Design an enzyme around this catalytic site. Structure first.
Site, PDB file in Angstrom:
ATOM      1  N   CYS A 179      31.091  50.601  65.792  1.00 25.83           N
ATOM      2  CA  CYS A 179      31.998  51.364  64.950  1.00 25.83           C
ATOM      3  C   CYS A 179      33.375  51.552  65.557  1.00 25.83           C
ATOM      4  O   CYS A 179      33.543  51.509  66.778  1.00 25.83           O
ATOM      5  CB  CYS A 179      31.391  52.714  64.530  1.00 25.83           C
ATOM      6  SG  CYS A 179      31.181  53.908  65.864  1.00 25.83           S
ATOM      7  N   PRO A 195      29.233  52.195  69.769  1.00 29.39           N
ATOM      8  CA  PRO A 195      30.396  52.890  69.201  1.00 29.39           C
ATOM      9  C   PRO A 195      31.679  52.623  69.989  1.00 29.39           C
ATOM     10  O   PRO A 195      31.653  52.668  71.218  1.00 29.39           O
ATOM     11  CB  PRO A 195      30.018  54.367  69.330  1.00 29.39           C
ATOM     12  CG  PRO A 195      28.486  54.375  69.341  1.00 29.39           C
ATOM     13  CD  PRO A 195      28.119  53.125  70.082  1.00 29.39           C
ATOM     14  N   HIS A 196      32.787  52.382  69.292  1.00 29.78           N
ATOM     15  CA  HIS A 196      34.074  52.123  69.953  1.00 29.78           C
ATOM     16  C   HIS A 196      35.219  52.960  69.394  1.00 29.78           C
ATOM     17  O   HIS A 196      35.136  53.495  68.290  1.00 29.78           O
ATOM     18  CB  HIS A 196      34.483  50.644  69.807  1.00 29.78           C
ATOM     19  CG  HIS A 196      33.861  49.730  70.814  1.00 29.78           C
ATOM     20  ND1 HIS A 196      32.512  49.442  70.833  1.00 29.78           N
ATOM     21  CD2 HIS A 196      34.412  49.021  71.831  1.00 29.78           C
ATOM     22  CE1 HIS A 196      32.257  48.599  71.819  1.00 29.78           C
ATOM     23  NE2 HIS A 196      33.395  48.328  72.439  1.00 29.78           N
ATOM     24  N   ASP A 197      36.287  53.052  70.179  1.00 32.17           N
ATOM     25  CA  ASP A 197      37.629  53.286  69.655  1.00 32.17           C
ATOM     26  C   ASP A 197      37.837  54.566  68.832  1.00 32.17           C
ATOM     27  O   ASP A 197      37.960  54.519  67.604  1.00 32.17           O
ATOM     28  CB  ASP A 197      38.091  52.050  68.861  1.00 32.17           C
ATOM     29  CG  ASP A 197      38.368  50.832  69.765  1.00 32.17           C
ATOM     30  OD1 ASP A 197      38.496  51.001  70.983  1.00 32.17           O
ATOM     31  OD2 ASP A 197      38.459  49.701  69.266  1.00 32.17           O
TER      32      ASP A 197
END
Length: 424
Positions: free
Chosen positions: A227, A250-252
């Site tokens: 994500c 999950p990312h960023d």
């Protein structure tokens, strides 16, 4: 000397609750139209000048099955869409030979009626949604018509069907099996929840996407889950197995995430679970993460204010938990056992709190803290800054039977230890 953490209640995250989440009363419109008319598609594909690979897969000007202005289920699509583009090859078992776009006002559902939605690798099928989408008690798989089987992973750049959702969308997946999705291409990692690119976002202002993924199984995916700038997403009760780069990733600038009671294992190249680049104020608890190629669980690139609690983290081929340049986090009561390298490793991170963790029988140290200069490396220090400091507080728990000793912390800014058991 703080109290045990207060972890989010998971009781309401159920298939039953998910079924009651979309508006099925106003029927929607089904159109087979051109991909490049749609922002949902241009946003990751690019301009008209990037359309060639799609022209090749589809053997014509690129089309998509589009849902909008209300509710549509898979059984509806089958009836209204030509057999060449969406065929029932056996009862309950469908093959999509075009991508499916759920538009902004669309509402799309798949349920137990569908035994399997096969997405055609050769034809270039995938699923993008800017709207509402619910998938329950079924199978959506990346499918190779040539092999007559799952599009099993072979090489990074080979296209495989994937699922992607955009800003302002909401998605719910429950009791669903998905396999062999995603490859090494932007927004195409496998199952991706994403805000629009910043240029498109300053215009549309759609607000961050969200949703749940529960009691499902994900296999042979490039990333099990990905994500970008995503809010309060829930990932509970799932099995991520034999995935390629990452299990759950999950990312960023995602935040408020709930990653709980998942079983994540067998990741082929990297980590079971990683949150990278300002994934803040999230919850990682009661997961099993084991037998992954690198670490069990990683917090990376200034991912702060998180709680990692009561996870069973074992037999990973490097560390149990690694914190990379990610300060101000709480690790409470994790059982970090028999990882090949360190139990818990903390690099360039300050204000790490280790309370009641058991680190036992890891190959190297139970807890290893260090600093490292990242200036002469491939690191974009503008995007991802760092500070070569390490500091931590350890309270309670137990460090024993580790191969190199219970703990090592090199050049710490400060370490405090209170009533930790370290057995001889």
């Amino acid at each position: 000397e703080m109290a045990k953490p207060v972890l989010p209640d998971l009781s309401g995250y159920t298939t039953e609750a998910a079924l009651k989440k979309i508006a099925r009363n106003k029927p929607g419109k089904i159109t087979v139209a051109r991909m490049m008319e749609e922002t949902g598609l241009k946003e990751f594909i690019g301009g008209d000048n990037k359309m060639a690979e799609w022209v090749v897969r589809q053997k014509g000007i690129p089309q998509a099955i589009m849902i909008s202005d209300g509710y549509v289920n898979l059984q509806d699509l089958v009836k209204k869409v030509p057999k060449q583009f969406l065929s029932e090859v056996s009862p309950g078992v469908y093959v999509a030979r075009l991508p499916i776009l759920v538009k902004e006002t669309g509402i799309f559902e798949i349920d137990s009626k569908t035994k399997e939605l096969r997405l055609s690798q050769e034809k270039g099928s995938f699923i993008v949604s800017e709207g509402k989408m619910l998938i329950t008690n079924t199978s959506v798989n990346a499918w190779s018509e040539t092999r007559n089987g799952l599009a099993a992973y072979r090489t990074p750049d080979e296209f495989r069907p994937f699922v992607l959702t955009w800003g302002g969308s909401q998605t719910w997946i429950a009791k669903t099996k998905m396999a062999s999705m995603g490859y090494n291409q932007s927004k195409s990692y496998g199952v991706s929840i994403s805000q629009y690119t910043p240029n498109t976002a300053k215009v549309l202002k759609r607000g961050e996407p969200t949703g749940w993924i529960i009691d499902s199984e994900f296999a042979d995916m490039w990333y099990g889950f990905y994500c970008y700038e995503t809010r309060d997403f829930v990932v509970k009760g799932n099995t991520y197995r034999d995935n390629i780069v990452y299990g759950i990733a999950p990312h960023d600038r995602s935040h408020g995430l709930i990653i709980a009671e998942n079983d994540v294992y067998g990741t082929k190249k990297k980590h079971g679970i990683i949150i990278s680049r300002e994934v803040d104020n999230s919850f990682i608890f009661r997961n099993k993460s084991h037998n992954n190629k690198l670490s069990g669980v990683v917090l990376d690139r200034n991912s702060v204010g998180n709680i990692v609690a009561y996870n069973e983290i074992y037999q990973n081929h490097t560390d149990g938990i690694t914190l990379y340049e990610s300060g101000n986090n709480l690790l409470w009561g994790n059982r970090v056992i028999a990882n090949r390298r360190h139990g818990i490793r903390v690099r360039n991170s300050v204000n790490i709190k280790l309370y009641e963790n058991v680190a036992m029988a890891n190959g190297l140290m139970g807890v290893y803290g260090h600093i490292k200069d990242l200036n002469d490396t491939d690191r974009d220090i503008e995007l991802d800054p760092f500070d070569a400091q390490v500091s931590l507080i350890m309270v309670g728990g137990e460090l024993s039977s580790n191969g190199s000793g219970p703990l090592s912390i090199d050049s710490p800014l400060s370490v405090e230890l209170y009533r930790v058991s370290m057995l001889m």
